Scaffold this active site. Sequence first.
Site, PDB file in Angstrom:
ATOM      1  N   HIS A   1       2.137  -3.265  20.886  1.00 48.39           N
ATOM      2  CA  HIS A   1       1.047  -3.148  19.993  1.00 48.39           C
ATOM      3  C   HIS A   1       1.583  -3.357  18.534  1.00 48.39           C
ATOM      4  O   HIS A   1       1.644  -3.849  17.802  1.00 48.39           O
ATOM      5  CB  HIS A   1      -0.552  -2.012  20.094  1.00 48.39           C
ATOM      6  CG  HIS A   1      -1.935  -2.058  18.981  1.00 48.39           C
ATOM      7  ND1 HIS A   1      -2.914  -3.081  19.545  1.00 48.39           N
ATOM      8  CD2 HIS A   1      -1.937  -2.754  17.720  1.00 48.39           C
ATOM      9  CE1 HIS A   1      -3.741  -2.902  19.080  1.00 48.39           C
ATOM     10  NE2 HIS A   1      -3.085  -2.998  17.450  1.00 48.39           N
TER      11      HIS A   1
ATOM     12  N   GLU B   1      -5.709  -5.443  22.514  1.00 48.28           N
ATOM     13  CA  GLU B   1      -5.008  -4.546  23.665  1.00 48.28           C
ATOM     14  C   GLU B   1      -4.379  -5.738  25.108  1.00 48.28           C
ATOM     15  O   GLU B   1      -3.737  -5.346  25.237  1.00 48.28           O
ATOM     16  CB  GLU B   1      -6.240  -3.990  23.884  1.00 48.28           C
ATOM     17  CG  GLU B   1      -7.129  -3.423  22.457  1.00 48.28           C
ATOM     18  CD  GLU B   1      -7.580  -1.917  23.197  1.00 48.28           C
ATOM     19  OE1 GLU B   1      -6.351  -1.376  23.452  1.00 48.28           O
ATOM     20  OE2 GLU B   1      -7.999  -1.893  24.036  1.00 48.28           O
TER      21      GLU B   1
ATOM     22  N   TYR C   1      -8.806  -3.764  30.330  1.00 50.82           N
ATOM     23  CA  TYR C   1      -8.062  -4.156  28.999  1.00 50.82           C
ATOM     24  C   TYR C   1      -7.845  -5.144  28.652  1.00 50.82           C
ATOM     25  O   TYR C   1      -7.095  -5.665  27.832  1.00 50.82           O
ATOM     26  CB  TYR C   1      -6.425  -2.793  29.312  1.00 50.82           C
ATOM     27  CG  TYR C   1      -7.356  -1.124  28.266  1.00 50.82           C
ATOM     28  CD1 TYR C   1      -7.808  -0.992  27.167  1.00 50.82           C
ATOM     29  CD2 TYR C   1      -7.417  -0.099  28.577  1.00 50.82           C
ATOM     30  CE1 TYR C   1      -8.244  -0.060  26.269  1.00 50.82           C
ATOM     31  CE2 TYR C   1      -7.838   1.417  28.550  1.00 50.82           C
ATOM     32  CZ  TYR C   1      -7.465   1.243  27.147  1.00 50.82           C
ATOM     33  OH  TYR C   1      -8.277   2.137  26.153  1.00 50.82           O
TER      34      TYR C   1
ATOM     35  N   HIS D   1       2.068   0.749  26.276  1.00 50.57           N
ATOM     36  CA  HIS D   1       1.103  -0.439  25.630  1.00 50.57           C
ATOM     37  C   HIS D   1       0.873  -0.290  23.484  1.00 50.57           C
ATOM     38  O   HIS D   1       1.409  -1.246  23.588  1.00 50.57           O
ATOM     39  CB  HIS D   1      -0.043   0.455  26.037  1.00 50.57           C
ATOM     40  CG  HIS D   1      -1.746  -0.845  25.609  1.00 50.57           C
ATOM     41  ND1 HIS D   1      -2.779  -0.663  26.845  1.00 50.57           N
ATOM     42  CD2 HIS D   1      -2.166  -0.229  24.141  1.00 50.57           C
ATOM     43  CE1 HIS D   1      -3.690  -1.505  25.767  1.00 50.57           C
ATOM     44  NE2 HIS D   1      -3.783  -0.912  24.714  1.00 50.57           N
ATOM     45  N   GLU D   2       0.748   1.093  23.582  1.00 51.13           N
ATOM     46  CA  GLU D   2       0.355   1.056  21.607  1.00 51.13           C
ATOM     47  C   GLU D   2       2.106   0.173  21.342  1.00 51.13           C
ATOM     48  O   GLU D   2       2.143  -0.357  20.766  1.00 51.13           O
ATOM     49  CB  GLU D   2       1.013   2.401  21.862  1.00 51.13           C
ATOM     50  CG  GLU D   2      -0.648   3.755  22.217  1.00 51.13           C
ATOM     51  CD  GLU D   2      -0.243   5.037  22.267  1.00 51.13           C
ATOM     52  OE1 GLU D   2       0.137   5.370  21.458  1.00 51.13           O
ATOM     53  OE2 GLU D   2      -0.104   5.585  23.298  1.00 51.13           O
TER      54      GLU D   2
END
Length: 106
Positions: A20, A65, A58, A16-17
């Site tokens: 990002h 996000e 999310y 996920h990060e």
Amino acid sequence: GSKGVELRNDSEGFIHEFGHAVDDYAGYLLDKNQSDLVTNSKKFIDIFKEEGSNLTSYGRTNEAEFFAEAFRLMHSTDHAERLKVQKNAPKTFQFINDQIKFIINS
């Protein structure tokens, strides 16, 4: 970001990060202003307004996000997880797929 063992947060968090961080480099290089990430450029917050209430909670936090988990889901080893995104969001998937790129390295 990566805790603990794989109660899954580690892995699904880390990617996920990673999405990002792709948004980070994309925002540094592309776009124009203060607005720190490539999120909410191109077609002003459309993709997030509709599809950013569907992928998960999310997917409805900050747009940065929504993009990040969209990245996660886009590559999921569970390929069905990916089709949950396309099915529920036949444009967000295409968005990360437009931004199919090649940041880093390795």
